[PDB]
Every structure is written in C-alpha cells, then in structure tokens.
Amino acid sequence: STTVWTDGKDHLEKHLVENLNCIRHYPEPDAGTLRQMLAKRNSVDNNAILVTNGPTAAFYQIAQAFRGSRSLIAIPSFAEYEDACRMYEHEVCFYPSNEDIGEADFSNMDFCWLCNPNNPDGRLLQRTEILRLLNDHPDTTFVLDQSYVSFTTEEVIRPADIKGRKNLVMVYSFSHAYGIPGLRIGYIVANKDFMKRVAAFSTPWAVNALAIEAAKFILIHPAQFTLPIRKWQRNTVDFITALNRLDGVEVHPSGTTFFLLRLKKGTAAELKKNMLIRDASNFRGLDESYVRITTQRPAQNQLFIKALET
Amino acid sequence: EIVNFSTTVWTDGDKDHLEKHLVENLNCIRHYPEPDAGTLRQMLAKRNSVDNNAILVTNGPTAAFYQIAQAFRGSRSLIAIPSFAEYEDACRMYEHEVCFYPSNEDIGEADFSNMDFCWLCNPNNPDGRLLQRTEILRLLNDHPDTTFVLDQSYVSFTTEEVIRPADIKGRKNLVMVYSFSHAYGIPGLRIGYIVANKDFMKRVAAFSTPWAVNALAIEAAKFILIHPAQFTLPIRKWQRNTVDFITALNRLDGVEVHPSGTTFFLLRLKKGTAAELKKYMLEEYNMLIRDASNFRGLDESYVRITTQRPAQNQLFIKALETFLEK
Numbered sequence A: 001s002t003t004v005w006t007d008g009k010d011h012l013e014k015h016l017v018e019n020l021n022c023i024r025h026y027p028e029p030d031a032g033t034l035r036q037m038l039a040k041r042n043s044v045d046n047n048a049i050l051v052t053n054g055p056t057a058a059f060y061q062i063a064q065a066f067r068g069s070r071s072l073i074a075i076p077s078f079a080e081y082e083d084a085c086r087m088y089e090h091e092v093c094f095y096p097s098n099e100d101i102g103e104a105d106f107s108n109m110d111f112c113w114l115c116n117p118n119n120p121d122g123r124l125l126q127r128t129e130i131l132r133l134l135n136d137h138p139d140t141t142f143v144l145d146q147s148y149v150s151f152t153t154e155e156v157i158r159p160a161d162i163k164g165r166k167n168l169v170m171v172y173s174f175s176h177a178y179g180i181p182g183l184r185i186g187y188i189v190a191n192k193d194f195m196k197r198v199a200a201f202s203t204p205w206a207v208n209a210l211a212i213e214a215a216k217f218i219l220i221h222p223a224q225f226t227l228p229i230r231k232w233q234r235n236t237v238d239f240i241t242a243l244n245r246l247d248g249v250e251v252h253p254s255g256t257t258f259f260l261l262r263l264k265k266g267t268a269a270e271l272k273k274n275m276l277i278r279d280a281s282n283f284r285g286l287d288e289s290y291v292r293i294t295t296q297r298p299a300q301n302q303l304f305i306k307a308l309e310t
Numbered sequence B: 001e002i003v004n005f006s007t008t009v010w011t012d013g014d015k016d017h018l019e020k021h022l023v024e025n026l027n028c029i030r031h032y033p034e035p036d037a038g039t040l041r042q043m044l045a046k047r048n049s050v051d052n053n054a055i056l057v058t059n060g061p062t063a064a065f066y067q068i069a070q071a072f073r074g075s076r077s078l079i080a081i082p083s084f085a086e087y088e089d090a091c092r093m094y095e096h097e098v099c100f101y102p103s104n105e106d107i108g109e110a111d112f113s114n115m116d117f118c119w120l121c122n123p124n125n126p127d128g129r130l131l132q133r134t135e136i137l138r139l140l141n142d143h144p145d146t147t148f149v150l151d152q153s154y155v156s157f158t159t160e161e162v163i164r165p166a167d168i169k170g171r172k173n174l175v176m177v178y179s180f181s182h183a184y185g186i187p188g189l190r191i192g193y194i195v196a197n198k199d200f201m202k203r204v205a206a207f208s209t210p211w212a213v214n215a216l217a218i219e220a221a222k223f224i225l226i227h228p229a230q231f232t233l234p235i236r237k238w239q240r241n242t243v244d245f246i247t248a249l250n251r252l253d254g255v256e257v258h259p260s261g262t263t264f265f266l267l268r269l270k271k272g273t274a275a276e277l278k279k280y281m282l283e284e285y286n287m288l289i290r291d292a293s294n295f296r297g298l299d300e301s302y303v304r305i306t307t308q309r310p311a312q313n314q315l316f317i318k319a320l321e322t323f324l325e326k
Helices: A010-018 A020-024 A032-041 A054-065 A079-087 A127-136 A192-199 A209-219 A229-244 A268-272 A304-309 B016-024 B026-030 B038-047 B060-071 B085-093 B133-142 B198-205 B215-226 B235-251 B274-283 B310-324
Strands: A049-052 A070-075 A091-096 A111-115 A141-145 A168-173 A186-190 A249-251 A258-263 A290-294 B055-058 B076-081 B097-102 B117-121 B147-151 B174-179 B192-195 B255-257 B264-269 B302-306
Touching: A010 A020, A010 A209, A010 B026, A020 A209, A020 B016, A032 A049, A032 A209, A049 A054, A049 A192, A054 A079, A054 A141, A054 A168, A054 A186, A054 A192, A070 A079, A079 A091, A079 A111, A127 A141, A186 A192, A229 A249, A229 A258, A229 A304, A268 A290, B016 B026, B016 B215, B026 B215, B038 B055, B038 B215, B055 B060, B055 B198, B060 B085, B060 B147, B060 B174, B060 B192, B060 B198, B076 B085, B085 B097, B085 B117, B133 B147, B235 B255, B235 B264, B235 B310, B274 B302, B274 B310
Parallel strands: A070 A091, A070 A111, A111 A141, A141 A168, B076 B097, B076 B117, B117 B147, B147 B174
Antiparallel strands: A049 A186, A168 A186, A249 A258, A258 A290, B055 B192, B174 B192, B255 B264, B264 B302
16 A cells, blocks of 8 residues: 555654654754764765655655756656646656656756656666766756665665766655654755755755654664565565466566556456555556555465455 | 743643653554645634634644745735744745834834735734734724734733634635644644635645645644643733743843733843843853844844743843843
C-alpha cells in the first residue's frame, strides 16, 4: 500500500518522548541548525540546503519559484509533480517512464521531473545515464525526487553532484527511508542561484519542532537508521516470482521493493474490496487494471499470494 | 532556569495530560496524516457552529497569513502598526500594495476607499490594543468591500466580548485566523486554522498542499477540543497580575508602560536602549525580554513584556531598577 520503509523502533521514539517539551517553543524559523548539519553531512554548502515541510511541500515551492516554466514529467509518477506544476501555471509535457529518458525531446524544456527509483514503476536510471542528461541538456534543470535513493543498491547520484552544475536540483525525504511520514520533513539541495529563487518563498516556522528533533537524531545515528536494503529486495524478488506464476496476473518488473501488478480480468477497486493495497488507477498512464504493491516480510508476502489466488 | 518575558505564549498551562496523550499516540508519526486534516476540520466546524466548508486547518497561524496573501496577490492591504511582522511579510511576498495605519488611533476612521484587505489583531501584538466586538462590527458593516482579516490568536487573552467564528454568517468580508500556539503553549506543533465564508475560502483552497498539517499536531488539537475545561486559560488571574505588574513598573523612574488591554504590553525606556536592557536582564539576571525595536513604528527604546508569575514579576522589577541606576 505505501512506499514507506515500515519495518524499521523506540530509540527514535524514546528520544521524542524525552524531548517532547520542544513543542512548547518555536522551532528555529529557519530549521537553521538542522540545515547546517545536513550541509556538512552531505558535503555540500550551507546555502545549498533548504529544510522543508515534507518532500511534497518542496516540490510545490520549486514549481512556485519558476512559474510559467515548461515542465517535462515522466509518467506514471508521483501525482505531486504534476499538481505543483499546474498550481503554478507550468506548461506540462508528458513522457513515458518506460521509454528511454534520453530519447525524449528537451529542446524547449525548462524542467524535467525525475524520481529514481520511480514511483510506481520502480523504474531505475543508472547513476551514469543521469550525469549525461545533466551534461547534454544544461538549459533544462532536472528535479530529482530522491525519496527512494535508499530503496536500491546500484549507485545513485548524491548531493555533492551539484558542484560544477546548475541544472541539478534534489529533493530528499524523511517519510520513506525512516518511516516517519507523519512528521512532515524533507529538504532541497540546489546550486545557489536556484536556491535564491526558491528561498524568496520560504515562510518562517514552516518546519515543526518534533520533525526537526527527529531529523537531528537520525543524523547523529547513521547506523541505527540504515535500511536493510539487500534483504528487502531479495524478498521482493521472491514475492514477484510467486506472483508471475499466478494466473490472470502479471507483474511489471521493478528496480526496487514496490512494483506494479496488472490484472488480466478483474478491477483494482474490486481486488481492494486485512491487507491494504494501492489501486494505481489514479496515476496518469495506468488504467483500472493496475495496482502498486510494496514488498513486506516473507510470511505476509507468502500470504498475499493466497488471498489473491482465491 | 531562565525566566521568559519575551513570548506572547501562555506558558503556565497544565500540559501533563496533553503530553501524555501524544506519548500514547506517538505511532501517528508513522502514517501520513489525513492530507486534508479532514476529521479535525469537521470537529472544528461543529464546535464553532460553522460549516465544514468554512474551516481550513493550517500549518500554524503564520502559514494561514501567507496562504491568504497568496490567494489575493493583486491586492491592496491596510495594515495597523505596530503588529505581528508576518502580516507585512505575507503581503510583500505576494506583492500587495501595503498601507500603514496607527493601531492607537481609531481604525474606524482610516481610509478604506480602495482597500481590499484590512489586517487586525485583537487584542494586538505588541500593543495590547483592544477594539470592542462592537467597534469591529460597524467596520465590517460600513466597509463591505474590504475583507477584514482578524488574527484571533489572542482572542482568549481577554475577558471582554470577542468576535467569534459564527460571525462569518451573512457576512462576506470577515475572515478569521485561529491559533493553537499561544493559548495552549504549543508553538512547536505548528497548528492553526482559517474561518471564512466559502466563496472566500475557495480562493484560498486553490493553493492548499496535501499533508501540510503534521500528525501529532492534528492529535494535540483533537485533544484540546475534547477537553475545553482542561485547556481553559486563567485570564482573570493573569490580567490582574498584569495590573500589579504595570503599577509597579510605572512607579519606576526612567520607564513608561504603554497602556494595555491584555497580559503582555510595551514598555519605553526614557534612556537606554532595548538591546542594552535585554542583554543585561539576560546576562546579569537570567531573564529574557523581547527587544521590540524591529516592529514597524517603534524604535530602540521599546521592549515587549509578558506578565509571568508574581514572584518572577517582583524579581524582574529589581532586575530593572538595578539597570536604571546604571
């Protein structure tokens, strides 16, 4: 149902419980101290981080800073790239995430919005296929949804890749990798002329005090919040082979731990009517036959096959 | 260990039970909140005698000021000063043409001719200026073509009769912005809300972003709403400690306290600066005060002070007296 790494404990929660009084005071209007910690950690400049009320808020603030830009959006994809581009009167062009991104026409594209690995495709672009996009189309700025940068092993572009570039902008998330969608925190990494344009629309105290406290704890404790990614995909591999062999159901490949699956007969809404699943009908480029599915833990996997078979 | 005189937040509330409640429902951080905070919205509407259509939960009351400014980028705004700097910042960010006007002169008698918005806060930060529920009603009535945006953050920091959410009814030119930060000591949770008639409300909804209100905040608010008594503020006792505080302050020589209708107030140094005063009180006496210099319409002689406990107030008077003699 959700693209959130969920089987992660009370060591972050003990911390929050101990520091609950932080809700009695204003956060830095700036989340300025977290910003600095993220900058030094990510080996990027201080003025190249901007802490945001969740990864979603960040997409909206980027759209807004460049109203009337022309945007290229790979579909199917997170609906928010599109809603944000529309709220700010971008002319939006679509392009299939299953066609090679390189063969798309960037001639008149100010922005290209990628998520990689992609939601829901799981489509995964090599770290190298992207570095050359950035080189071949300098007049296009690539907004890379980095939400699932952790849900894979093959190398990724990272924040320090902004250096000697101007057409790379990144959005990081705390909801997915660390299991805290309810806290609403993320951040933008960008070269500093772009960030200046983004910053003009920052509002004070947009990032809540618990979220900042939680983010600081996650940073002072790398090892405690490392996603067991190897183990995760290996389980999805097993979960899908067990799905392909079923009949009247085929599973579109993925580069990560969630993936789409298609019904030959039978509707998403109906297969949705105590396990939750994502009816993928509401992505552009997917019809009623499609659902997104996130790889859980063996027992509950091997027990999905069954409730479906029937 | 530091005593805080610099915030307009009610700090002495009973929070053990609110806080125990968040500890119990801490798992809410693991799931998206309603994108909409729709259940909170629903319970606010009912509590406030208003339609579901007329509330919009926001990421703090500040967020609401900006979302309103945004929805009306063209607009001309009349802002009373001094006031919360955020009305101004909002209006600027969204390129409003901004007219100023003195809060302690009668706003009922300013120039509303081509004003699309008028921004008030009652009782006012930092002044404590308080308009009668009645003075406000004739403004709403006399100027149909000005939307009045009424910061209600401090609506409970007064004994007097206030405008309330159910005033939007049969009235299109009233908008309220409510707050959970001030009355309930939870500024760090970032939660507040808009009350407006639904024609206005839909101009602002057009810029709403999902999951803008975080989960724990939704949860704190739900708890406060279910327990009106528990979170009721002791306003008579605070107001009255404020009188004993202001009286002692005026007796001091070299300082003047601007009259106030609520539990915080401006004081003016005859000589010395706010920066000077604030550093001393902090370093010498472990007390924090608000340098009010950065308010439009005040210079470096002004500080904002919120009444703390009597014993702390008493001890702040010596702290100050000691300053003056230097």
